[PDB]
Enzyme design. Structure first.
Site, PDB file in Angstrom:
ATOM      1  N   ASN B  47       0.833  -1.209   0.000  1.00  0.00           N
ATOM      2  CA  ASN B  47       0.000   0.000   0.000  1.00  0.00           C
ATOM      3  C   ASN B  47       0.873   1.266   0.000  1.00  0.00           C
ATOM      4  O   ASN B  47       1.807   1.371   0.828  1.00  0.00           O
ATOM      5  CB  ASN B  47      -0.963  -0.059   1.173  1.00  0.00           C
ATOM      6  N   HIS B  58      -3.570   0.763  -3.369  1.00  0.00           N
ATOM      7  CA  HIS B  58      -3.741  -0.373  -2.432  1.00  0.00           C
ATOM      8  C   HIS B  58      -2.600  -1.367  -2.664  1.00  0.00           C
ATOM      9  O   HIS B  58      -1.890  -1.311  -3.706  1.00  0.00           O
ATOM     10  CB  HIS B  58      -5.115  -1.030  -2.549  1.00  0.00           C
ATOM     11  N   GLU B  60      -2.665  -4.494  -3.452  1.00  0.00           N
ATOM     12  CA  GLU B  60      -2.941  -5.404  -4.610  1.00  0.00           C
ATOM     13  C   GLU B  60      -2.699  -4.626  -5.898  1.00  0.00           C
ATOM     14  O   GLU B  60      -2.043  -5.134  -6.834  1.00  0.00           O
ATOM     15  CB  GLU B  60      -4.373  -5.881  -4.503  1.00  0.00           C
ATOM     16  N   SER B  85      -7.649  -9.529   2.903  1.00  0.00           N
ATOM     17  CA  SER B  85      -8.783  -9.798   1.988  1.00  0.00           C
ATOM     18  C   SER B  85      -9.067  -8.564   1.133  1.00  0.00           C
ATOM     19  O   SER B  85      -8.987  -7.427   1.601  1.00  0.00           O
ATOM     20  CB  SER B  85     -10.002 -10.263   2.749  1.00  0.00           C
ATOM     21  N   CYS B  87     -10.425  -5.441  -1.120  1.00  0.00           N
ATOM     22  CA  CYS B  87     -11.580  -4.517  -1.226  1.00  0.00           C
ATOM     23  C   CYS B  87     -12.241  -4.732  -2.601  1.00  0.00           C
ATOM     24  O   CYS B  87     -11.749  -5.563  -3.422  1.00  0.00           O
ATOM     25  CB  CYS B  87     -11.132  -3.079  -0.998  1.00  0.00           C
ATOM     26  N   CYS B  90      -9.766  -3.887  -5.589  1.00  0.00           N
ATOM     27  CA  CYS B  90      -8.694  -4.877  -5.834  1.00  0.00           C
ATOM     28  C   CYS B  90      -9.330  -6.181  -6.339  1.00  0.00           C
ATOM     29  O   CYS B  90      -8.724  -6.860  -7.184  1.00  0.00           O
ATOM     30  CB  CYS B  90      -7.891  -5.018  -4.552  1.00  0.00           C
ATOM     31  N   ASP B 151      -8.162   4.678   4.157  1.00  0.00           N
ATOM     32  CA  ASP B 151      -7.719   3.638   3.197  1.00  0.00           C
ATOM     33  C   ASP B 151      -8.895   2.769   2.728  1.00  0.00           C
ATOM     34  O   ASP B 151      -8.809   2.213   1.627  1.00  0.00           O
ATOM     35  CB  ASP B 151      -6.635   2.743   3.816  1.00  0.00           C
TER      36      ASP B 151
HETATM   37 ZN   LIG Z   1      -8.068  -2.650  -2.367  1.00  0.00          ZN
END
Ligand SMILES: [Zn+2]
Ligand SMILES: [Zn+2]
Lengths: 155, 154
Positions: B47, B58, B60, B85, B87, B90, B151
């Site tokens: 991130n 992010h 990912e 996990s 969002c 992503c 975030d």
């Molecule tokens: Zn994300």
């Protein structure tokens, strides 16, 4: 026009999105533009275009570039905005809209490109207005006329 | 539901990224993308919200940006490793690139509708429930809750 009704900042938002797509085109990229407007006062939080060719970027779609250019914002700011995009959003840009709680997306056209994203926004209770803007259809056509292998490799 | 031999490496690297981001003063979420066929790490990232003032990087997304532009044929036999996990954004990236498999450190500190959406769309999701990942992420959320809320758009 499908998916909703025009509201007072939609001419301004789509005009900026198109200007960003035209700037991207002149740079040698894919003509996809966006901007994020506060629904209350019409202020422009940010504007951007697709930087795939300009930066060799996998993730800088027009909508991602627009959100990047707005900078860091408190979550509450996104809740009364509209994201303007010249082109229907892919699953990732759909995901950005949903994650930030951007209630409304105004789309230039979905003839040259449409993903399951457009429907998924409606599944998740977001508004997606497709205005079928001929200026967006035309500039995307000029890119595809010149660079079909760059376009069909992307999508 | 068979393991990849690369999953230990993938989660080790993802965690390395998360710990690096934490040390830089950012959100401790890290990832990498591995070619399932030969164990090649194609990219790795964390991130970058605080590091770069970024509303899109992010962990990912950073990972996938770091890989550069890959061919669809390559993304279709990769695993994306993430410490947390994903969002909805992503999750959308994974679907858009056609990445078939996502290995998740933990979904205790955070879970979106994206985790189930991935499975709806035909992607394999593996949650390892890694205690290293849960600890560093809980520590950040406890100490910097407003930064966490920014975030995730809350
Ligand atoms: Zn994300
Ligand atoms: Zn997109």
């Amino acid at each position: 026009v499908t998916g909703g009704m025009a509201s007072k900042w939609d001419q301004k938002g789509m005009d900026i999105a198109y200007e960003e797509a035209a700037l991207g085109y002149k740079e040698g990229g894919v003509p996809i533009g966006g901007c994020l407007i506060n629904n209350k006062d019409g202020s422009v939080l940010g504007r951007g275009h697709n930087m795939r060719f300009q930066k060799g970027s996998a993730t800088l779609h027009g909508e991602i570039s627009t959100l990047e250019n707005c900078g860091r914002l408190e979550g509450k700011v996104y809740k009364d905005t509209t994201l303007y995009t010249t082109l229907s959003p892919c699953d990732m840009c759909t995901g950005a809209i949903i994650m930030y709680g951007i209630p409304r997306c105004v789309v230039g056209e979905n003839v040259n490109f449409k993903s399951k994203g457009e429907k998924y926004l409606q599944t998740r209770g977001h508004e997606v207005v497709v205005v079928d803007d001929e200026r967006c259809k035309k500039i995307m056509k000029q890119f595809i006329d010149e660079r079909p292998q760059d376009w069909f490799e992307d999508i």
